[PDB]
Amino acid sequence: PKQVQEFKQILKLLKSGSIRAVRVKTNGENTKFKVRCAKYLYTYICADKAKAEELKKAIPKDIHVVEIAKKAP
Amino acid sequence: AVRVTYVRKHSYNTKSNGIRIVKTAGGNMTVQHRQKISNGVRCGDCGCVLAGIRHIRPHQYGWLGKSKRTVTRAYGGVKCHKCVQKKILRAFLINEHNLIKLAAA
Amino acid sequence: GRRTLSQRKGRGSIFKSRSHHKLGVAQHRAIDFFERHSTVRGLVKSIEHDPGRGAPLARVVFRNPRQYGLDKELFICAEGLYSGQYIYCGSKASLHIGNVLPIGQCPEGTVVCNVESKPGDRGIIARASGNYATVISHNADNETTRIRLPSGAKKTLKSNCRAMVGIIAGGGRTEKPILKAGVAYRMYKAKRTTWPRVRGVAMNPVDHPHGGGNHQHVGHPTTLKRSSPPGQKAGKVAARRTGLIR
Amino acid sequence: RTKKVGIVGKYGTRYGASLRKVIKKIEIAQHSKYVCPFCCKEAVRRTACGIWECKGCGKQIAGGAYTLSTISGATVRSTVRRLRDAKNSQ
Amino acid sequence: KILAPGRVVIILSGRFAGKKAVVSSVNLQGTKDRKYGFVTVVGVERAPLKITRKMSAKVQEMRTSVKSFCKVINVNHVMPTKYTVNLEQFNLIKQVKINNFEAGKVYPISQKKAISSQFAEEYRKGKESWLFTKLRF
RNA sequence: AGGAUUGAAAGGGAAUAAGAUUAAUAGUUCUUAAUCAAGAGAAAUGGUAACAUAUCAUGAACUUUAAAAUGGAGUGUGAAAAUCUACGGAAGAGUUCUCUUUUCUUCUUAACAAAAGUAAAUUCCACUGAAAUGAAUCAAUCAGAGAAGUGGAAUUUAUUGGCUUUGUAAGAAAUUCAAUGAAUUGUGGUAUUUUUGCAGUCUUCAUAAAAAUUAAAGGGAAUCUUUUGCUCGUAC
RNA sequence: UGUAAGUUAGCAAGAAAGAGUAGCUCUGGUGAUCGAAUCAGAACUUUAAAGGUUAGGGGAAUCCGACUGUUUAAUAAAAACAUAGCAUUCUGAUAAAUCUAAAAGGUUCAUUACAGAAUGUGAUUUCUGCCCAGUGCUCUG
RNA sequence: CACUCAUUUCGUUAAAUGUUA
């Protein structure tokens, strides 16, 4: 597992076709966008709800998205 | 305290059977397997440990980057800077002495 | 009777040399043209402790006379040799300590070591600690020279027999009194199995020719002929004299 | 600290007065420092029997078993030097 | 003066250890940024290779190419030699000044190849020989 | 090109962890997350220097170097874990007509990687040149073949880079509560022990393995995705 | 607190001999920019205190072996063996000793007299007297 | 007595031996 640091690199990950799945985990303070790629699982810790919504919109519609909360699937 | 067991079937505390007991989730402790401590590179002349090269197992040098297993200098990774500096002075001063002593003195 | 310990030593089962950590064979380099008619230069890279022998060994590196590469040698270090020294082997080598010269090039009275008994056999005589041979006289009529062995005997060798100029390092090793049986035990760590020696008188008649009776005594003369068979050749053999000499 | 049993005090009372006195002379010389013949620093120390290493100067020298240079090897060095002069000059 | 412009020196330490270089300017006192005695040297990073009659003319010219470098070096890290070049023949070396060196960024590749080309041209004419032979340590 | 076979389930050695699961196997199954090997799709810069740059930035024959790979004792010390303990609590349990703001239990987190913050030890580099000699250690030990001081480089510290922290990752697990759903999961210590390194000291008429295999150098000849991973042991 | 003869001057030595020690309430000393158990002292009380467990009996001589060590598994652990020290003998390596029926065979020997091989006595101090007829051994006869 | 040619003991990568030039 690797972590992307700022908002720019994460977008290029969803823009690229290498993506396989996306899981969004909402915590009591932040929300993590975990992009399941071929080799690694990249994650972005978004602490701003406004920028979280922007990242949710940028997800391609043909990919599976899992929304996680206090209860795991 | 929590007592542990070996995971592999080596029952003796040999050099390759080193373990570390670390804490895991729920309070129980698991057994790791720790690497052996390795030496570094030595200058071929003075036998001093060379700088800029990590002390890892021989097969792990292949995994490193190209620049991480040598020094960007003549005889880098086999001779110290003091070892090299004397090689340069030996080469130039002996040839210069031969030029005047012999070779049309 | 049984077989004595001297007989069991010849089969070599537990009495084999404990030569596992030894550096190697210490000798001169093989004689070639460049050492018969010229000189080669060798660098003393290091001085090491050869297990089982009292003198230090030198790791000399001659470059190569005919091919490309190195020629790593292993000499018996002469006293005064140091790391990084240049030594020379050859007929025209200078008379300096550590150089290897034919014995005929050494002046009379020269002190040499690691002398060859037969030319090209890479050293036989004067190899233990602090030991040396002295050149007595030369004889150009038959190309032979006379040297004095460390035991005092004189030997006549071919003038092209090779030897190293100087004293074998490590002298005075035997002048230090061993004090403990443990120290003597460690002395044979890289040697044969010989140390704890049971006296023959302390054995039984089956074990030894000295194996006594109700009193610990030999009972017969301890000076024996050289023609005594193995198993009875215990004691002093062909003893010309005997006792505290005056 | 001790009147006369200085370094052989580690032997206690169990090897004979003379044997402790003979080895006392040798152990003092064996564990002493010597002047380096190349850099003149009192830094040469024995590592193995016959091997003397010069600490602050980086030289390994072959010598005696318990001293840097034996008296027998000292005359030999002077004997060879004199013999070489005779050969070099006539 | 041992270290004067035009003097040939040998670099002792650094990436260019054992290369041959020509002194351009000398500053034994140093500056505010350079707190040491230093000289600016133009050197031969890659000495030319030997050529024979069998190699074609385009291979011969390629094989005789000289790779140069310009570097500020501590005066303690160079060993001066007894050789001197004519700074008029190597005119481009004269313009390699201290201010031309900016700490942190790459030396201009245009100046390096301009000196490199003229270094190879003088080697082809055979005017300087000790400068363009690789020193075998 | 140099010497054949066998010889270690304690020596050397490419690479996997946590949780769950079975009446019984599990670094082997399942979930998630990794790693390794073998495959497929006229030749760079920076720094004075020590040396440094997500492959970068070519490097054949030949040769060399280093690693794998090396005793023991004793002292000091870095880090982790366990034990003990300070502060602040959350949840549950024990005693309670005699008191006890009380006693007890849980408050955790892997391999592999990241690089906010910040260490100890050692070795080197630049400036300058030390006597009125200084520097320092438990001990030592060191210095014009250059001390101390100032500023730097490197390596070691049980994976990347030692520790806190971060991704994995709380969604697991632990402790509770309700009838599957909810709650919590701070910060410290000039303390002891074990483990693991490190630094110098001592000791030897003792100097305390080799090979497979790996990397680098000198030389200058030539011009991200994806596939597979066989055999045997594995119960007690 | 104190400790003798003897001594290889290192020891003997924990010699021998004597006094103290509990509980409670306090004080002081030993550091860093709050903390460590450790030491010393002072009141008062008692059944007068290491002792539940753990935990040397000591002295004066003599004999043997110097010492650490080893030994008759299953009646002998020692004064026996080893030991370091001392001394003797042979041997220049194609040798000495010595295994093998033989052997470009084997061992000490990857060695070379400060070494290899064969023996006796058994640390240190002091001393090793006279005898070469006999039996050995040796001779450059 | 002189030689080497069987024979003995060796050393090497059988790596400049011997005679002229």
| DSSP per-residue codes, chain B | ------SSS--S--TT----EEE-GGG-EEE--PPPP----B-TTT-PBPSSS----GGGGTTS-GGGGS-SSTTTTTS-HHHHHHHHHHHHHHHHHHHHHSS--
Closest CA to A9 of A63, A46, A39, A47: A46
CA torsion angle for D65, D70, D74, D75 (degrees, to 10)? -120
The token duo for D42 is 């009192």
At E23 the three-state DSSP class reads strand
The technique is: cryo-EM
H or E segment at C47?
A: strand C39-49
| Angle subtended by helix axes A7-15 and A49-57, to nearest 10 | 20
**Distance (Å, whole) CA E93 – CA E70:** 9
Greatest Cα-to-Cα distance within chain E, rounded to the nearest angstrom: 55
| Vertex E33: Cα angle to E29 and E37 (nearest 5) | 25
| Vertex D74: Cα angle to D73 and D76 (nearest 5) | 60
**Distance (Å, whole) CA E97 – CA D8:** 72
Q: Chains meeting D at 3+ CB pairs closer than 8 A?
A: C
Helices (H) and strands (E) in chain C, counts: 3, 13
- Taking residue C50's Cβ as centre, other Cβ atoms within 10 Å add up to 20
Of E10, E13, E137, the CB nearest to B81: E13
At E20 the three-state DSSP class reads strand
Give the resolution in Å: 2.8
Q: Closest Cα of chain C to D62: distance in Å?
A: 5
From the number of C-beta atoms within 10 Å of its C-beta (0-12, 13-18, 19+), residue D73 rates as buried
Q: List strand residue ranges (DSSP E) for D1-85, in order.
A: 34-35, 42-48, 51-54, 59-62
Sign of CA dihedral B51, B55, B59, B62: negative
Partners of residue C195 on adjacent β-strands = none
Closest CA to A14 of A72, A65, A48: A65
What spatial distance separates the first Cα and last Cα of chain A, rounded to whole Å?
20
At D90 the three-state DSSP class reads coil
Task: For residue C63, give the amino acid letter.
Answer: R
| G135 C1': nearest CA residue | C221
CB contact under 8 A, B88 and E15: no
C36: nearest nucleotide, CA–C1' criterion: H16
Cα B38 to Cα B33, B68, B77, B90, C26: the distances in Å are 16, 17, 16, 33, 32
At E12 the three-state DSSP class reads coil
- Taking residue E129's Cβ as centre, other Cβ atoms within 10 Å add up to 8
Which one of E12, E20, E137 would you mutate to disrupt binding with B, by most B Cβ within 10 Å of its Cβ?
A: E137
| CB within 8 Å of B9: residues ≥ 6 apart | none
| CB within 8 Å of A46: residues ≥ 6 apart | A7, A30, A31, A32, A33, A52, A55
| CB of D15 lies under 7 Å from some atom of strand G | yes
Sign of CA dihedral B96, B97, B100, B103: negative
**Distance (Å, whole) CA D68 – CA C242:** 39
How many whole angstroms from its chain centre is CA C179? Answer: 25
Cα B19 to Cα B27, B39, E90: the distances in Å are 18, 20, 66
CB contact under 8 A, C82 and D38: yes
SS (H, E, C) A37-66: CCCCEEEEEECCHHHHHHHHHCCCCCCCEE
With beta carbons less than 8 A apart as the criterion, state whether B84 and E17 touch: yes
CB contact under 8 A, C56 and D51: yes
Using the structure block, give the residue that is written with the tokens 């397997």: B33
With beta carbons less than 8 A apart as the criterion, state whether E15 and E69 touch: no
Closest CA to D50 of B58, E83, C168: C168
Of B74, B90, B96, the CB nearest to E17: B74
- Taking residue E116's Cβ as centre, other Cβ atoms within 10 Å add up to 21
Of E13, E135, E136, the CB nearest to B85: E13
Task: For residue C94, give the amino acid letter.
Answer: S
- Taking residue C148's Cβ as centre, other Cβ atoms within 10 Å add up to 16
Per CB-CB distance under 8 Å, the chain B contacts of E17 are 73-74, 81, 84-85, 88
List, as one string, the DSSP characters of C92-107: T--S-TT-EEEGGGSP
Q: Chains meeting B at 3+ CB pairs closer than 8 A?
A: E
